[PDB]
Amino acid sequence: THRQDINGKEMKFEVLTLASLTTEIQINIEIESRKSYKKMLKEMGEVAP
Amino acid sequence: ALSKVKLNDTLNKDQLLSSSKYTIQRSTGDSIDTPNYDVQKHINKLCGMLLITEDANHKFTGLIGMLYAMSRLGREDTIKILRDAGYHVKANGVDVTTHRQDINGKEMKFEVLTLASLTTEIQINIEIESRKSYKKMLKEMGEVAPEYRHDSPDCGMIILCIAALVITKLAAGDRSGLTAVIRRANNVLKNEMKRYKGLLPKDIANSFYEVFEKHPHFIDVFVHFGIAQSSTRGGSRVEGIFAGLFMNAYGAGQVMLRWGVLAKSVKNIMLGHASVQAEMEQVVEVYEYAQKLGGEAGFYHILNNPKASLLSLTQFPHFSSVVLGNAAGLGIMGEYRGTPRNQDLYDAAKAYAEQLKENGVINYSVLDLTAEELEAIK
Amino acid sequence: ALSKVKLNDTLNKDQLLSSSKYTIQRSTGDSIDTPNYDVQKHINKLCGMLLITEDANHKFTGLIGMLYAMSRLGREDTIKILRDAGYHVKANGVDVTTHRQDINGKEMKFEVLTLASLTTEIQINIEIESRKSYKKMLKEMGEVAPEYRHDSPDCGMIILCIAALVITKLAAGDRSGLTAVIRRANNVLKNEMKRYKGLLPKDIANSFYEVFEKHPHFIDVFVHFGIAQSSTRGGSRVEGIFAGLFMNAYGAGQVMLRWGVLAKSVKNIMLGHASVQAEMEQVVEVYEYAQKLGGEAGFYHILNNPKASLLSLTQFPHFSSVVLGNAAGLGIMGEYRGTPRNQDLYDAAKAYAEQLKENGVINYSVLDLTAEELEAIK
């Protein structure tokens, strides 16, 4: 578990300990996914499985 | 035969408790973070950074000290201790992880441990305060030494020396021996206190009092760690100090047995009183029980062992009164706040004990003097 | 029975410490360079080049001396010692390597050892200074001998003799016995000091003090090396000197036990005093504990063994005062800076001990004189 302050807010991030893939990269992947998810949710209302 | 009218109550209670064929086993609560030998250097580093920090926040010093003790015991011995004490433990593996964050607008790398008890932010803060204090000290004296650093391999064991003092005073039942802990931690470990600015005996002692009050299984783990530490073949000077302070806790909560042995040794006359002689059979039963228990009985009152009550002598008011009076007369009872409940026997024993010191005659029979020309030398 | 009111505290504490079913095991820190029999000649050569160098840099003499001790023990015995002492050790194999560099604008070949503790440049510098001193001495006397060279097979054991003296004085707790070490190293090893110009007892002794302070596991390794060295069937004269100086450390930190035995032997009268007789039961318990421990107990205070505190007699102020007074009267206490805490018993014992030497009568009963015509010879 990694906590850091993006957008001036404390949020918790769940990552894996990989020598090949750094923690910052996993955090960035999750952040971009969250942005895209919220944009899609705004543009269609409700998400599905 | 009237001499056969006897009940061996102490031995019978011990036999009842030691032949139980059913066992309870308790739940510790949260998961226990059990470090192994791997993170011992990191925990010792954390202790060193706590020690070099003036005005250190010692809220977690007891927790870190117990982590250090558990890492020197190892995961397997710690887990086995917790099973043998009769506890359900969910062991947590402790491993080292790297955390990067931006303080002062700069990217810097931090090396922490995965502990459920001690959060990552707390470890980072400990390291940051240690760094500030280190740079301030470096500025104020020019160059640091192995004496003033977190890398010293005894930084954890100084904290465990404070813990050993707290263990010596745990039998009082509360934080009443805190002043004694602070005094003895100033006498002992004075060079260390000059060395480390964050070594505050009161703060560390309060932290250890708190951790022992919250988690009574940490008392068990620490006592068995201190027995394993004192069972080594040797060590450094700080480890020797710890062993000496941890053997200071042996017999804690059982001062009246030692004072009764002392009252017998100085041959106090009030032990020949009729009521004391009435109680002698059972007091002797108690002493035989103690010497049958042996070494394990020295930590019964620290550990809150149930069989601690069987070592009590207060169920013998006249013998206890004579023992307390002898201690008071010899000037060793100090501020012991156990009270005699036979005032007359107490006063008589105190008077005789005071008379003992003033008087005193050499007993030449205990030597092997074949010819005694000492009479002419007088 | 009042005689049954006894607590065998010393034996009970020993039983507690010797029956521990959990063990700690510590981390030595950096990797330990463990040489084997292969590099023993090279380490002895290094010691010889250190010895033949006037104004030698003895900063690493303690480290090299411990390397020599470890190479005579071997890799397997050294590693087993470190496990038995309860240490995590990362053993480093030590092997010989060749290094060529250009000093004085010339290509010359240098033979060094791969040690993490001792860098290659340091070994090269040691050899260079040794070469300069050797050529200067050769110029000033014409021809060298086996006496004046690094090839002597006792060059390492002279350094270990200095180490043995430091071990004898380690129980004082600091570098306070340095003057005694220097004095005894001038008395003993005087021919060697005439032989080797780089044999500076103060510098070597300070180096060994420093290495023992830094690495408390080197004290363990050295004590067990000295026991293994004294367990041989024979050796050279320097090895005999080392064995004699290493048995000088037996019982260090326990002088009061020996002085109590001496006070009993000279039949000091103050041992019959009432308070001493009160303490006799427990002091006898301590003596039985010491003689039950046997030979291993002679190095408890050097090694910082935790059970060293159980051998103390200072918990018996009256007996200790009589013992110190007897020593003071017999004129052996010297500059011992342990203080009596019963002044009157100390003074009385001192007075009687002084009276002992002046007086003295032959006890004819200890012989087998059937007919005593000695009366007529008077």
mmCIF file of C-alpha atoms in Angstrom, chain B residues 32-358:
data_model
loop_
_atom_site.group_PDB
_atom_site.id
_atom_site.type_symbol
_atom_site.label_atom_id
_atom_site.label_comp_id
_atom_site.label_asym_id
_atom_site.label_seq_id
_atom_site.Cartn_x
_atom_site.Cartn_y
_atom_site.Cartn_z
ATOM 1 C CA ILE B 32 1.293 -9.719 15.737
ATOM 2 C CA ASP B 33 4.071 -8.328 13.549
ATOM 3 C CA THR B 34 6.819 -10.917 13.934
ATOM 4 C CA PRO B 35 10.142 -9.756 12.463
ATOM 5 C CA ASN B 36 12.903 -12.212 11.643
ATOM 6 C CA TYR B 37 16.683 -11.858 11.652
ATOM 7 C CA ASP B 38 16.509 -10.140 8.257
ATOM 8 C CA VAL B 39 15.160 -6.791 9.474
ATOM 9 C CA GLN B 40 17.196 -6.697 12.696
ATOM 10 C CA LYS B 41 19.605 -4.131 11.259
ATOM 11 C CA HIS B 42 16.727 -1.957 10.066
ATOM 12 C CA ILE B 43 15.017 -2.045 13.465
ATOM 13 C CA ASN B 44 18.319 -1.195 15.157
ATOM 14 C CA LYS B 45 18.714 1.665 12.677
ATOM 15 C CA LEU B 46 15.238 2.916 13.602
ATOM 16 C CA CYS B 47 16.183 2.783 17.289
ATOM 17 C CA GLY B 48 19.358 4.739 16.563
ATOM 18 C CA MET B 49 17.477 7.454 14.695
ATOM 19 C CA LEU B 50 15.104 7.643 17.661
ATOM 20 C CA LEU B 51 18.071 8.003 20.017
ATOM 21 C CA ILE B 52 19.919 10.751 18.113
ATOM 22 C CA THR B 53 16.816 12.981 17.959
ATOM 23 C CA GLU B 54 16.616 15.605 20.687
ATOM 24 C CA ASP B 55 13.041 16.102 21.895
ATOM 25 C CA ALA B 56 12.217 12.802 20.203
ATOM 26 C CA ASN B 57 8.630 11.594 19.928
ATOM 27 C CA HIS B 58 8.801 8.437 22.047
ATOM 28 C CA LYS B 59 5.182 7.405 21.495
ATOM 29 C CA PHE B 60 6.278 4.309 19.543
ATOM 30 C CA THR B 61 9.601 3.563 21.262
ATOM 31 C CA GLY B 62 8.131 0.675 23.251
ATOM 32 C CA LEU B 63 6.643 -0.857 20.112
ATOM 33 C CA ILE B 64 9.946 -0.525 18.240
ATOM 34 C CA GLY B 65 11.867 -1.942 21.195
ATOM 35 C CA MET B 66 9.612 -4.974 21.247
ATOM 36 C CA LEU B 67 10.105 -5.305 17.494
ATOM 37 C CA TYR B 68 13.862 -5.335 18.088
ATOM 38 C CA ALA B 69 13.526 -7.976 20.801
ATOM 39 C CA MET B 70 11.343 -10.099 18.516
ATOM 40 C CA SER B 71 13.817 -9.779 15.630
ATOM 41 C CA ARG B 72 16.660 -10.964 17.849
ATOM 42 C CA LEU B 73 14.489 -13.881 18.954
ATOM 43 C CA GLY B 74 13.515 -14.564 15.354
ATOM 44 C CA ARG B 75 10.160 -15.404 13.831
ATOM 45 C CA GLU B 76 10.221 -19.072 14.841
ATOM 46 C CA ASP B 77 11.165 -18.574 18.492
ATOM 47 C CA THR B 78 8.747 -15.650 18.864
ATOM 48 C CA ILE B 79 5.871 -17.656 17.405
ATOM 49 C CA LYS B 80 6.759 -20.640 19.593
ATOM 50 C CA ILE B 81 6.834 -18.365 22.651
ATOM 51 C CA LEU B 82 3.370 -17.081 21.802
ATOM 52 C CA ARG B 83 1.961 -20.597 21.366
ATOM 53 C CA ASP B 84 3.549 -21.769 24.616
ATOM 54 C CA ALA B 85 2.061 -18.797 26.463
ATOM 55 C CA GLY B 86 -1.321 -19.970 25.164
ATOM 56 C CA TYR B 87 -2.201 -17.346 22.563
ATOM 57 C CA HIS B 88 -3.806 -17.398 19.140
ATOM 58 C CA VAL B 89 -1.473 -15.290 17.009
ATOM 59 C CA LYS B 90 -1.842 -14.223 13.390
ATOM 60 C CA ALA B 91 1.819 -13.704 12.558
ATOM 61 C CA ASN B 92 2.648 -10.894 10.137
ATOM 62 C CA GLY B 93 5.801 -11.188 8.071
ATOM 63 C CA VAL B 94 7.954 -8.063 8.274
ATOM 64 C CA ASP B 95 9.973 -7.086 5.209
ATOM 65 C CA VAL B 96 11.720 -3.967 3.970
ATOM 66 C CA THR B 97 10.132 -1.736 1.333
ATOM 67 C CA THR B 98 11.168 1.436 -0.476
ATOM 68 C CA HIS B 99 8.988 4.558 -0.462
ATOM 69 C CA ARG B 100 9.626 7.718 -2.481
ATOM 70 C CA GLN B 101 7.833 10.939 -1.618
ATOM 71 C CA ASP B 102 8.283 14.666 -2.152
ATOM 72 C CA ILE B 103 9.125 16.573 1.017
ATOM 73 C CA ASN B 104 10.603 20.062 0.601
ATOM 74 C CA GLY B 105 9.707 19.724 -3.076
ATOM 75 C CA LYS B 106 12.413 17.092 -3.603
ATOM 76 C CA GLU B 107 12.242 13.420 -4.547
ATOM 77 C CA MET B 108 13.976 11.344 -1.880
ATOM 78 C CA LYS B 109 14.029 7.615 -1.241
ATOM 79 C CA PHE B 110 12.990 6.139 2.110
ATOM 80 C CA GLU B 111 13.563 2.603 3.396
ATOM 81 C CA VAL B 112 10.806 1.368 5.721
ATOM 82 C CA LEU B 113 9.363 -1.851 7.143
ATOM 83 C CA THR B 114 5.895 -3.284 6.527
ATOM 84 C CA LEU B 115 4.375 -3.258 10.009
ATOM 85 C CA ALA B 116 0.673 -3.224 10.801
ATOM 86 C CA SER B 117 1.475 -1.744 14.220
ATOM 87 C CA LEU B 118 3.771 1.051 12.987
ATOM 88 C CA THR B 119 2.617 2.950 9.908
ATOM 89 C CA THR B 120 4.903 4.039 7.081
ATOM 90 C CA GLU B 121 4.325 7.758 7.686
ATOM 91 C CA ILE B 122 5.499 7.354 11.282
ATOM 92 C CA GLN B 123 8.765 5.720 10.211
ATOM 93 C CA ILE B 124 9.312 8.460 7.630
ATOM 94 C CA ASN B 125 8.740 11.131 10.270
ATOM 95 C CA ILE B 126 11.178 9.414 12.635
ATOM 96 C CA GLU B 127 13.825 9.417 9.909
ATOM 97 C CA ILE B 128 13.154 13.059 8.980
ATOM 98 C CA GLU B 129 13.489 14.301 12.558
ATOM 99 C CA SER B 130 16.634 12.215 12.959
ATOM 100 C CA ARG B 131 18.089 13.804 9.821
ATOM 101 C CA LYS B 132 17.316 17.319 11.059
ATOM 102 C CA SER B 133 18.911 16.625 14.439
ATOM 103 C CA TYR B 134 21.920 14.966 12.798
ATOM 104 C CA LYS B 135 22.597 17.924 10.516
ATOM 105 C CA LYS B 136 22.155 20.390 13.389
ATOM 106 C CA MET B 137 24.632 18.431 15.525
ATOM 107 C CA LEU B 138 27.054 18.146 12.597
ATOM 108 C CA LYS B 139 26.876 21.917 12.141
ATOM 109 C CA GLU B 140 27.420 22.540 15.855
ATOM 110 C CA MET B 141 30.433 20.214 16.239
ATOM 111 C CA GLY B 142 31.919 19.808 12.749
ATOM 112 C CA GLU B 143 32.282 16.039 12.329
ATOM 113 C CA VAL B 144 30.309 13.090 13.698
ATOM 114 C CA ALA B 145 31.748 9.897 15.205
ATOM 115 C CA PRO B 146 30.571 6.290 15.561
ATOM 116 C CA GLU B 147 29.500 7.362 19.051
ATOM 117 C CA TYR B 148 26.922 9.813 17.668
ATOM 118 C CA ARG B 149 25.037 7.899 14.986
ATOM 119 C CA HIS B 150 22.182 5.505 14.271
ATOM 120 C CA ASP B 151 24.646 2.894 12.950
ATOM 121 C CA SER B 152 25.814 1.886 16.436
ATOM 122 C CA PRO B 153 24.856 -1.786 16.970
ATOM 123 C CA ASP B 154 23.799 -1.093 20.585
ATOM 124 C CA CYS B 155 21.117 1.525 19.862
ATOM 125 C CA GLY B 156 18.360 -1.056 20.244
ATOM 126 C CA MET B 157 19.825 -2.555 23.390
ATOM 127 C CA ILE B 158 19.996 0.802 25.174
ATOM 128 C CA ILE B 159 16.237 1.083 24.670
ATOM 129 C CA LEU B 160 15.902 -2.487 25.893
ATOM 130 C CA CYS B 161 17.896 -1.498 28.994
ATOM 131 C CA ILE B 162 15.220 1.095 29.745
ATOM 132 C CA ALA B 163 12.690 -1.686 29.145
ATOM 133 C CA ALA B 164 14.552 -3.916 31.612
ATOM 134 C CA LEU B 165 14.293 -1.232 34.292
ATOM 135 C CA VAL B 166 10.553 -0.937 33.637
ATOM 136 C CA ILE B 167 10.302 -4.724 33.982
ATOM 137 C CA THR B 168 12.094 -4.551 37.334
ATOM 138 C CA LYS B 169 9.438 -2.104 38.524
ATOM 139 C CA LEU B 170 6.395 -3.772 36.913
ATOM 140 C CA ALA B 171 5.547 -5.746 40.067
ATOM 141 C CA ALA B 172 4.342 -2.557 41.790
ATOM 142 C CA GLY B 173 1.152 -2.860 39.713
ATOM 143 C CA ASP B 174 1.219 0.573 38.045
ATOM 144 C CA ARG B 175 3.539 3.403 36.992
ATOM 145 C CA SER B 176 4.685 4.047 40.566
ATOM 146 C CA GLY B 177 8.292 2.981 40.077
ATOM 147 C CA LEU B 178 8.780 5.482 37.269
ATOM 148 C CA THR B 179 10.913 7.728 39.480
ATOM 149 C CA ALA B 180 13.106 4.773 40.438
ATOM 150 C CA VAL B 181 13.383 3.852 36.755
ATOM 151 C CA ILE B 182 14.482 7.393 35.882
ATOM 152 C CA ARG B 183 16.991 7.517 38.746
ATOM 153 C CA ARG B 184 18.564 4.151 37.926
ATOM 154 C CA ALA B 185 18.608 5.083 34.232
ATOM 155 C CA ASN B 186 20.557 8.205 35.138
ATOM 156 C CA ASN B 187 23.034 6.260 37.288
ATOM 157 C CA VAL B 188 23.399 3.400 34.829
ATOM 158 C CA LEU B 189 23.711 4.498 31.194
ATOM 159 C CA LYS B 190 25.079 7.948 32.082
ATOM 160 C CA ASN B 191 27.715 7.860 29.341
ATOM 161 C CA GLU B 192 24.977 6.856 26.906
ATOM 162 C CA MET B 193 22.818 9.783 28.035
ATOM 163 C CA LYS B 194 25.727 12.118 27.377
ATOM 164 C CA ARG B 195 26.084 10.374 24.014
ATOM 165 C CA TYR B 196 22.473 10.416 22.784
ATOM 166 C CA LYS B 197 20.347 13.553 23.045
ATOM 167 C CA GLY B 198 17.118 11.687 22.376
ATOM 168 C CA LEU B 199 17.672 9.221 25.205
ATOM 169 C CA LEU B 200 14.974 10.503 27.533
ATOM 170 C CA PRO B 201 14.455 7.886 30.271
ATOM 171 C CA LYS B 202 11.030 9.191 31.304
ATOM 172 C CA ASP B 203 9.565 9.203 27.787
ATOM 173 C CA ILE B 204 10.945 5.779 26.856
ATOM 174 C CA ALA B 205 9.883 4.342 30.214
ATOM 175 C CA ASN B 206 6.342 5.683 29.803
ATOM 176 C CA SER B 207 6.237 4.213 26.296
ATOM 177 C CA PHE B 208 7.242 0.798 27.625
ATOM 178 C CA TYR B 209 4.779 1.025 30.519
ATOM 179 C CA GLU B 210 2.070 1.789 27.964
ATOM 180 C CA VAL B 211 2.994 -1.045 25.599
ATOM 181 C CA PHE B 212 3.141 -3.542 28.473
ATOM 182 C CA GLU B 213 -0.246 -2.383 29.767
ATOM 183 C CA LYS B 214 -1.872 -2.694 26.333
ATOM 184 C CA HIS B 215 -0.316 -6.035 25.316
ATOM 185 C CA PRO B 216 0.322 -8.433 28.222
ATOM 186 C CA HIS B 217 1.810 -10.932 25.760
ATOM 187 C CA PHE B 218 4.658 -8.492 25.137
ATOM 188 C CA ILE B 219 5.640 -8.947 28.787
ATOM 189 C CA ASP B 220 5.913 -12.680 28.115
ATOM 190 C CA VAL B 221 7.879 -12.166 24.897
ATOM 191 C CA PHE B 222 10.234 -9.684 26.563
ATOM 192 C CA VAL B 223 10.879 -11.843 29.624
ATOM 193 C CA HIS B 224 11.735 -14.815 27.441
ATOM 194 C CA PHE B 225 13.887 -12.621 25.202
ATOM 195 C CA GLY B 226 15.758 -11.409 28.266
ATOM 196 C CA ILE B 227 16.269 -14.978 29.424
ATOM 197 C CA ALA B 228 17.570 -15.943 25.975
ATOM 198 C CA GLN B 229 19.799 -12.855 25.880
ATOM 199 C CA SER B 230 21.246 -13.679 29.291
ATOM 200 C CA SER B 231 21.804 -17.275 28.130
ATOM 201 C CA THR B 232 24.431 -16.257 25.570
ATOM 202 C CA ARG B 233 28.153 -16.941 25.839
ATOM 203 C CA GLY B 234 29.078 -13.253 25.798
ATOM 204 C CA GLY B 235 28.453 -9.928 24.164
ATOM 205 C CA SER B 236 29.223 -6.232 24.270
ATOM 206 C CA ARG B 237 29.173 -3.965 27.308
ATOM 207 C CA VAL B 238 25.635 -2.732 26.616
ATOM 208 C CA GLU B 239 24.362 -6.307 26.415
ATOM 209 C CA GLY B 240 26.050 -6.962 29.750
ATOM 210 C CA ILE B 241 24.331 -3.910 31.215
ATOM 211 C CA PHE B 242 21.020 -5.252 29.926
ATOM 212 C CA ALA B 243 21.644 -8.681 31.441
ATOM 213 C CA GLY B 244 22.530 -7.103 34.775
ATOM 214 C CA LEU B 245 19.399 -4.956 34.793
ATOM 215 C CA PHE B 246 17.223 -7.882 33.721
ATOM 216 C CA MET B 247 18.495 -10.056 36.567
ATOM 217 C CA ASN B 248 17.570 -7.099 38.778
ATOM 218 C CA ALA B 249 13.961 -8.116 38.085
ATOM 219 C CA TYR B 250 14.442 -11.638 39.440
ATOM 220 C CA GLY B 251 12.338 -12.072 42.552
ATOM 221 C CA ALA B 252 10.389 -8.871 41.954
ATOM 222 C CA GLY B 253 7.149 -8.937 43.888
ATOM 223 C CA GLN B 254 8.606 -11.455 46.362
ATOM 224 C CA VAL B 255 10.712 -9.258 48.645
ATOM 225 C CA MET B 256 9.204 -10.755 51.793
ATOM 226 C CA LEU B 257 10.697 -14.186 51.100
ATOM 227 C CA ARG B 258 14.166 -12.645 50.864
ATOM 228 C CA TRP B 259 13.573 -10.542 53.975
ATOM 229 C CA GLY B 260 12.411 -13.638 55.848
ATOM 230 C CA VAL B 261 15.605 -15.434 54.881
ATOM 231 C CA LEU B 262 17.466 -12.356 56.119
ATOM 232 C CA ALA B 263 15.537 -12.328 59.405
ATOM 233 C CA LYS B 264 16.527 -15.952 59.906
ATOM 234 C CA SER B 265 20.155 -15.166 59.035
ATOM 235 C CA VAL B 266 20.600 -12.322 61.543
ATOM 236 C CA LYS B 267 18.959 -14.557 64.182
ATOM 237 C CA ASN B 268 16.192 -12.169 65.169
ATOM 238 C CA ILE B 269 14.827 -13.284 68.527
ATOM 239 C CA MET B 270 11.174 -12.590 67.738
ATOM 240 C CA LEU B 271 11.205 -15.584 65.389
ATOM 241 C CA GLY B 272 11.049 -17.641 68.594
ATOM 242 C CA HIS B 273 7.755 -16.080 69.668
ATOM 243 C CA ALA B 274 4.845 -18.452 70.215
ATOM 244 C CA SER B 275 2.652 -17.234 67.345
ATOM 245 C CA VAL B 276 5.518 -17.172 64.848
ATOM 246 C CA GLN B 277 6.362 -20.715 65.926
ATOM 247 C CA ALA B 278 2.726 -21.620 65.317
ATOM 248 C CA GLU B 279 3.025 -20.411 61.715
ATOM 249 C CA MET B 280 6.484 -21.895 61.059
ATOM 250 C CA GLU B 281 5.196 -25.162 59.563
ATOM 251 C CA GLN B 282 3.269 -23.435 56.791
ATOM 252 C CA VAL B 283 5.912 -20.780 56.173
ATOM 253 C CA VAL B 284 8.437 -23.594 55.720
ATOM 254 C CA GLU B 285 6.002 -25.247 53.309
ATOM 255 C CA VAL B 286 5.984 -22.007 51.294
ATOM 256 C CA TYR B 287 9.786 -21.863 51.242
ATOM 257 C CA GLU B 288 10.076 -25.477 50.084
ATOM 258 C CA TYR B 289 7.543 -24.678 47.365
ATOM 259 C CA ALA B 290 9.629 -21.713 46.199
ATOM 260 C CA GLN B 291 12.843 -23.723 46.097
ATOM 261 C CA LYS B 292 11.038 -26.552 44.296
ATOM 262 C CA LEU B 293 9.856 -24.088 41.656
ATOM 263 C CA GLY B 294 13.415 -22.856 41.309
ATOM 264 C CA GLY B 295 14.384 -20.267 38.728
ATOM 265 C CA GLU B 296 11.061 -20.027 36.907
ATOM 266 C CA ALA B 297 9.450 -18.569 40.042
ATOM 267 C CA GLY B 298 11.596 -15.426 39.916
ATOM 268 C CA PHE B 299 9.400 -13.869 37.216
ATOM 269 C CA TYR B 300 5.984 -15.034 38.446
ATOM 270 C CA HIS B 301 4.893 -11.584 39.609
ATOM 271 C CA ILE B 302 6.223 -9.765 36.539
ATOM 272 C CA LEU B 303 4.384 -12.193 34.264
ATOM 273 C CA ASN B 304 1.164 -12.210 36.336
ATOM 274 C CA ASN B 305 1.582 -15.952 36.703
ATOM 275 C CA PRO B 306 -1.456 -17.372 38.536
ATOM 276 C CA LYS B 307 0.739 -19.362 40.942
ATOM 277 C CA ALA B 308 2.265 -16.104 42.198
ATOM 278 C CA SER B 309 -0.226 -16.030 45.081
ATOM 279 C CA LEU B 310 1.173 -19.317 46.404
ATOM 280 C CA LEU B 311 4.487 -17.584 47.173
ATOM 281 C CA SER B 312 2.860 -14.996 49.438
ATOM 282 C CA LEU B 313 3.748 -14.838 53.124
ATOM 283 C CA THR B 314 1.126 -12.246 54.109
ATOM 284 C CA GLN B 315 -1.178 -15.123 55.104
ATOM 285 C CA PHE B 316 1.147 -15.432 58.091
ATOM 286 C CA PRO B 317 0.604 -12.127 59.905
ATOM 287 C CA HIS B 318 2.940 -12.794 62.839
ATOM 288 C CA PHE B 319 5.853 -14.102 60.778
ATOM 289 C CA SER B 320 5.355 -11.298 58.264
ATOM 290 C CA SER B 321 5.290 -8.748 61.082
ATOM 291 C CA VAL B 322 8.551 -10.073 62.514
ATOM 292 C CA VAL B 323 10.122 -10.050 59.041
ATOM 293 C CA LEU B 324 9.022 -6.471 58.347
ATOM 294 C CA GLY B 325 10.220 -5.368 61.772
ATOM 295 C CA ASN B 326 13.617 -6.935 61.199
ATOM 296 C CA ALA B 327 13.863 -5.166 57.843
ATOM 297 C CA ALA B 328 12.841 -1.845 59.419
ATOM 298 C CA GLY B 329 15.389 -2.187 62.209
ATOM 299 C CA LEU B 330 18.206 -3.119 59.836
ATOM 300 C CA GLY B 331 17.382 0.004 57.814
ATOM 301 C CA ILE B 332 16.650 -1.713 54.506
ATOM 302 C CA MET B 333 12.850 -1.551 54.263
ATOM 303 C CA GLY B 334 13.062 1.977 52.880
ATOM 304 C CA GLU B 335 9.768 3.215 51.458
ATOM 305 C CA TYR B 336 8.239 -0.256 51.237
ATOM 306 C CA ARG B 337 4.516 0.383 51.661
ATOM 307 C CA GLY B 338 3.534 -3.029 52.898
ATOM 308 C CA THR B 339 2.196 -2.676 56.409
ATOM 309 C CA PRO B 340 2.610 -4.971 59.428
ATOM 310 C CA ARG B 341 -0.655 -6.234 60.870
ATOM 311 C CA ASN B 342 0.799 -7.204 64.257
ATOM 312 C CA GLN B 343 2.133 -3.925 65.624
ATOM 313 C CA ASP B 344 3.701 -5.372 68.778
ATOM 314 C CA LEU B 345 5.720 -8.053 66.982
ATOM 315 C CA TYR B 346 6.803 -5.449 64.429
ATOM 316 C CA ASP B 347 8.027 -3.098 67.158
ATOM 317 C CA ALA B 348 9.828 -5.853 69.072
ATOM 318 C CA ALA B 349 11.578 -7.160 65.956
ATOM 319 C CA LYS B 350 12.557 -3.624 64.958
ATOM 320 C CA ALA B 351 14.010 -2.948 68.407
ATOM 321 C CA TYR B 352 16.055 -6.146 68.385
ATOM 322 C CA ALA B 353 17.289 -5.523 64.836
ATOM 323 C CA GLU B 354 18.450 -2.052 65.853
ATOM 324 C CA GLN B 355 20.229 -3.615 68.829
ATOM 325 C CA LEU B 356 21.998 -6.053 66.481
ATOM 326 C CA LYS B 357 24.062 -3.451 64.621
ATOM 327 C CA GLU B 358 25.446 -1.750 67.739
#
